[PDB]
Scaffold this active site. Structure first.
Site, PDB file in Angstrom:
ATOM      1  N   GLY A   1       0.818  -1.234   0.000  1.00  0.00           N
ATOM      2  CA  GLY A   1       0.000   0.000   0.000  1.00  0.00           C
ATOM      3  C   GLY A   1       0.845   1.275   0.000  1.00  0.00           C
ATOM      4  O   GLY A   1       0.500   2.247  -0.686  1.00  0.00           O
TER       5      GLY A   1
ATOM      6  N   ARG B   1       0.614  10.317  -9.227  1.00  0.00           N
ATOM      7  CA  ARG B   1       0.086  10.516  -7.860  1.00  0.00           C
ATOM      8  C   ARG B   1       1.080  10.117  -6.786  1.00  0.00           C
ATOM      9  O   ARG B   1       0.690   9.855  -5.657  1.00  0.00           O
ATOM     10  CB  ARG B   1      -1.270   9.767  -7.663  1.00  0.00           C
ATOM     11  CG  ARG B   1      -2.392  10.365  -8.502  1.00  0.00           C
ATOM     12  CD  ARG B   1      -3.493   9.342  -8.821  1.00  0.00           C
ATOM     13  NE  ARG B   1      -4.568  10.037  -9.555  1.00  0.00           N
ATOM     14  CZ  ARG B   1      -5.536  10.756  -8.980  1.00  0.00           C
ATOM     15  NH1 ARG B   1      -5.633  10.865  -7.656  1.00  0.00           N
ATOM     16  NH2 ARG B   1      -6.404  11.400  -9.744  1.00  0.00           N
TER      17      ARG B   1
ATOM     18  N   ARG C   1       0.576  -9.489  -2.719  1.00  0.00           N
ATOM     19  CA  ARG C   1       0.511  -8.300  -1.870  1.00  0.00           C
ATOM     20  C   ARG C   1       1.132  -8.610  -0.505  1.00  0.00           C
ATOM     21  O   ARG C   1       0.851  -9.661   0.092  1.00  0.00           O
ATOM     22  CB  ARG C   1      -0.955  -7.878  -1.725  1.00  0.00           C
ATOM     23  CG  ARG C   1      -1.178  -6.749  -0.716  1.00  0.00           C
ATOM     24  CD  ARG C   1      -2.678  -6.443  -0.548  1.00  0.00           C
ATOM     25  NE  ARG C   1      -3.076  -6.415   0.869  1.00  0.00           N
ATOM     26  CZ  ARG C   1      -2.668  -5.516   1.767  1.00  0.00           C
ATOM     27  NH1 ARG C   1      -1.833  -4.540   1.435  1.00  0.00           N
ATOM     28  NH2 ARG C   1      -3.082  -5.616   3.025  1.00  0.00           N
ATOM     29  N   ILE C   2       1.997  -7.717  -0.011  1.00  0.00           N
ATOM     30  CA  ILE C   2       2.516  -7.837   1.348  1.00  0.00           C
ATOM     31  C   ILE C   2       2.199  -6.552   2.142  1.00  0.00           C
ATOM     32  O   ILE C   2       2.516  -5.452   1.702  1.00  0.00           O
ATOM     33  CB  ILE C   2       4.022  -8.266   1.430  1.00  0.00           C
ATOM     34  CG1 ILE C   2       4.966  -7.308   0.684  1.00  0.00           C
ATOM     35  CG2 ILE C   2       4.210  -9.689   0.906  1.00  0.00           C
ATOM     36  CD1 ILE C   2       6.452  -7.669   0.788  1.00  0.00           C
TER      37      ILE C   2
ATOM     38  N   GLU D   1      -7.273  -5.971   7.786  1.00  0.00           N
ATOM     39  CA  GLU D   1      -6.565  -5.081   6.906  1.00  0.00           C
ATOM     40  C   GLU D   1      -7.598  -4.456   5.935  1.00  0.00           C
ATOM     41  O   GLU D   1      -8.795  -4.500   6.241  1.00  0.00           O
ATOM     42  CB  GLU D   1      -5.329  -5.756   6.250  1.00  0.00           C
ATOM     43  CG  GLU D   1      -5.564  -7.116   5.576  1.00  0.00           C
ATOM     44  CD  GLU D   1      -6.351  -6.973   4.295  1.00  0.00           C
ATOM     45  OE1 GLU D   1      -7.581  -7.265   4.372  1.00  0.00           O
ATOM     46  OE2 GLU D   1      -5.770  -6.523   3.276  1.00  0.00           O
ATOM     47  N   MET D   2      -7.177  -3.837   4.826  1.00  0.00           N
ATOM     48  CA  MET D   2      -8.135  -3.035   4.054  1.00  0.00           C
ATOM     49  C   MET D   2      -8.096  -3.239   2.533  1.00  0.00           C
ATOM     50  O   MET D   2      -8.768  -2.490   1.797  1.00  0.00           O
ATOM     51  CB  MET D   2      -8.009  -1.540   4.392  1.00  0.00           C
ATOM     52  CG  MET D   2      -8.163  -1.225   5.861  1.00  0.00           C
ATOM     53  SD  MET D   2      -8.089   0.552   6.214  1.00  0.00           S
ATOM     54  CE  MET D   2      -9.456   1.203   5.276  1.00  0.00           C
TER      55      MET D   2
ATOM     56  N   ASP E   1       0.353  -4.694  15.023  1.00  0.00           N
ATOM     57  CA  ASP E   1      -0.492  -4.084  16.070  1.00  0.00           C
ATOM     58  C   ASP E   1      -1.466  -5.176  16.463  1.00  0.00           C
ATOM     59  O   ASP E   1      -1.869  -5.976  15.627  1.00  0.00           O
ATOM     60  CB  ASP E   1      -1.279  -2.875  15.525  1.00  0.00           C
ATOM     61  CG  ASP E   1      -0.376  -1.715  15.121  1.00  0.00           C
ATOM     62  OD1 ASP E   1       0.121  -1.007  16.035  1.00  0.00           O
ATOM     63  OD2 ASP E   1      -0.157  -1.517  13.898  1.00  0.00           O
TER      64      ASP E   1
END
Lengths: 233, 233, 233, 233, 233, 233
Positions: free
Chosen positions: D20, D43, D87-88, D179-180, D204
């Site tokens: 991300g 971006r 993805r990590i 996660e998201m 966390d």
């Protein structure tokens, strides 16, 4: 101080312009502000504080999509004491009422997201901006001679839609354009008793079917930028 | 004609004031309008045309609940060529931001109805009024020395709620009061490209249990009636 | 006494006929009842008590839509002790099994409203009448030689549908007609442990497009009215 | 080439690692990839190509939330012809079965998003990774002495949850962490016939509120970077 | 001929009794029918044809749950020409108005299944029996001296409920018992223009927490069996 | 001890094979197990215990549809302490990639049921098997020279679909086949912290139009049965 912003508390002014693109934020700071300072840069998501013709304003990047937008707006309000938030982004036109170049003021943000149902009792939250801000936008645009298009936008979880067959229906219901953040900004500002508004410029046309380059998305919308800076000044 | 209105084509002026109660409608015609004529009375749902300060104005009752309001508003626009629809009513306040006798301008109408999901792709339609109409209310109120309370209302399918425990959450999200029609009026006007706005008079506070006496109820509704007539001249 | 009814607490007989139209209620009182008294008139929504062939019966208007119907039925049961509630309304036929002015007994009321989901755990409530009232309608119609059609109705929030392409599916699943209140009547009576039934006469035929005038909707249904009065004796 | 990626087709290798945070992507390129070249920067969302043990590997930032991750993955597959996406990320633990520093392989990604209902007939899409990639991860972890924790993750549209009272229930149903993005990555790869897997490091603990120091986070993240690079080479 | 029934077309009489348990089906054939022939046995799901007081009647097991019930009833109507379907099942009482072994006639079948939403436009289908059959049950119970309890049932996808806190609410809305099939039997017969009714005997009382004990469930429900056979005679 | 199983506590081994069809369970017992004993027979739903290569294994019928599967799985885990549950079922192919009698391992089970939304906060539960079991299946299949197809299945409440036009979309999203229990098996096992996996053999090919007889559904899938026994060894 928060997971996504590395500014000191007090580095933001109470009025903040937002863009999804941090390089648009950077362009605004360089082209329109004096004494500008980059105040945050976590994940390359830049924010600034500076002076627009002698008046303090902040700028902040919010990334793409409702989830991203909600993260930054939540932290701006709750931690950085930001009171007024004005999104100035890009959108895709779907309605015959608007043309390319046009700046749209979103008086409502409809959505295909489930975020508002999760927030609001699984009912329909009508996500709307602060009226005082919308009035200030209208009046400023009039003063400057910038012909503002006013209506709903539809905030989607999809840039690449699965529902292109529905664009006509959305246009019928006074959706001027599609973007991906306004309903998130509006609902978070409602949750947190803050003032928000979204303007967007029509760079792309979803039914005709033109598209600006990455560079033009940073550089083509100085009129919207000036409107925002003038209305918050 | 239509199943629910027995007016002749041409009987309605293009601007119409709407109330739930046809006896409130009657009251308005009898007290405020010159040359007032009853134009429809199917199901005892009364409507009138008359003049105010030289301007043609119609009045129409819409009954209680989104489904009832939708019927009348659809017929007014599609058959009777009504273009501007201004709804005035009481409400039940749920926010500490408002108190008895306040007039609310509803810039969004949230709902527990399924009607907007049916209309709008099973998504969340942000039901909003016409911006020019809202600007006209604000400027007229300013001229009249009325301080408008601007925010969302929540339009329920329930007068006797099963969710009273959720009123604080509604108020948190800037819902100033609860009524039963605005989300329908707004969606219908969006569907049909017509201009709509709802103003609500606070007569009861559902949290504080404040209630106006029957006489001050007549006086406060008179103040809202004057605002509306002044807006349509 | 309630916000919508200004009858005294013992004014209603325990058996009450209901129409959405207060003028059909007035019609019934004048043509069919001895010693008929108007007992309520708030919002022009009339109700009456009197005698039919020696036995007391009440009549009450409920307006249009589930939200309106629910307000009245809740108050009739809770404040006025009404035990048996018989709607004798109008509906739009969607099946060739019925024609204009046919009488339908709704053994189930399906719905596009969210009201029953809100009432009932977000699950499917099968809104149904009291079986003994249904039995009594069937037996009374046979005795009177009125040929009662029996099946489901679909209770919509819309008179002017956005789903006309689905009417064939509704007819396939044994829905004879569309009306706007039966599901609300049934769910309210279920919540409040009261006996309810809906009969409706066909006033619009959605296959044939034939539609009655407003006057005809008051006057053309004496067979339904007599059925109703007779089953209450 | 696309609105969000300014690489040329041919710039991305067919295997791509995703994070991300684009600054994390930069870190991986500068430390781990031979002949690391920046190939996109729209971006401020950086992407790179280079080599690991002789194998061409690309890196791409995806931003925060399902909507942002969907944009970038759609463009990487449909324009840039990426076939395999690993993805990590970090996540917040919710289950007693995991703790700080654990690496989780997500064999399912549940969600509170509406995106998969929109994609998938309004039904429940079980969003899952490619099995062969998950096998590769399991085998590579064993070889590296990584005790890989395996289960579902819950992909939320909310970083700041309104449903913290539900975390125990999610843990009961074998959701190890929140996660998201995973549900978006998985559904997009399913739509577009690509192979995808998500690994995440517990930074966390959302129940106990324990958290890694910034130093501790970078050290745990490195182990996961090695795992990903080793399984792709 | 079907994947689930190995009877020849024509083996079934047009009137068929239904139980979830194929061993109850067997018990009925052996105890109550003459010249009984087992006509199907796929998956141990037995069906029979025979004679009751000179009249042909069929019996068929349908397993547990709405999906299993739908399979068999669809096949019976569409392949095997069955016209009248009478379910005689068991249920768990949630009402004080009913006791162990009482027979409930389900005039409505509510559900927590998505099946009716899938079948019916995502709206609320009121799943209801054929009125003539229900009339036939009521008259036959009266003639035999059986006290039929009449009301809704709740048809759940869960034998082991996650919502036991809601049984009081279900009972408040006139659900006498919980079972798992009536909503599917009713919806399938409505789809396919067939006549269906569900009777259920109380085998478990979920409020008083009293239950019949295996022995015991075998000849326990003969009142229901005979009532069913008598109504088809 | 339970209403649906009459086995004694301790009668089941901790590893259990599952089929919807109790006659397939019976076939397995007689053909492949040494010293097999029928241990339960309620509602003709048979279950057995026996040995394979001297190791204890159990077999249990679960009937058809998610509600039925959930009953038996719930009881096997909670009452009978079953730790590893392996469904070896049948399915309807919707992908060209698989043929009649191919063996599919379901790495996710999508669904049109409401069961998982009821279970899981009205969100999307990604229903998935235990990873170690899926790894075991893969390795065991290699050892046996069986070509195991791997991907999602769609678990429907419908054998006779109302959405056949959607099959190509399900296939596009990596659904190899439709069956009716896997999502229920998976969610139940997730709820109760047990290990579960679904393998299914193709008995219907919905694209090519093949369909096995009832006898073939019992007898044609020895490879799947052998795979399952060997993975429990």
């Amino acid at each position: 101080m928060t997971p996504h912003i590395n500014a000191k508390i007090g580095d933001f002014y109470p009025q903040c312009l937002l863009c999804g693109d941090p390089l648009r934020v950077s362009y605004i700071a360089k082209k329109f502000l004096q004494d500008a300072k980059e105040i945050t840069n976590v994940r390359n998501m830049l924010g600034f504080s500076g002076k627009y013709k002698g008046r303090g304003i902040s700028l902040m990047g919010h990334g793409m999509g409702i989830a991203s937008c909600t993260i930054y707006v939540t932290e701006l309000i709750k931690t950085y004491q930001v009171k007024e938030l004005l999104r100035i982004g890009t959108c895709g036109a779907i309605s015959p009422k608007v043309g390319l170049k046009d700046i749209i003021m979103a008086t409502g943000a409809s959505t295909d997201s489930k975020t508002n149902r999760v927030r609001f009792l699984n009912h329909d939250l009508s996500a709307t901006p602060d009226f005082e801000l919308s009035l200030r936008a209208y009046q400023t645009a009039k003063r400057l001679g910038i012909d503002l298009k006013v209506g709903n936008v539809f905030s989607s979880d999809f840039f690449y839609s699965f529902e292109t067959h529905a664009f006509d229906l959305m246009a019928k219901y006074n959706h001027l354009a599609i973007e991906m953040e306004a309903a998130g900004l509006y609902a978070t500002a409602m949750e947190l008793n803050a003032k928000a508004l979204c303007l967007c410029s029509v760079s792309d046309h979803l039914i005709t079917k033109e598209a600006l380059s990455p560079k033009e998305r940073v550089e083509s919308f100085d009129n919207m930028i000036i409107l925002a800076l003038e209305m918050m000044s």
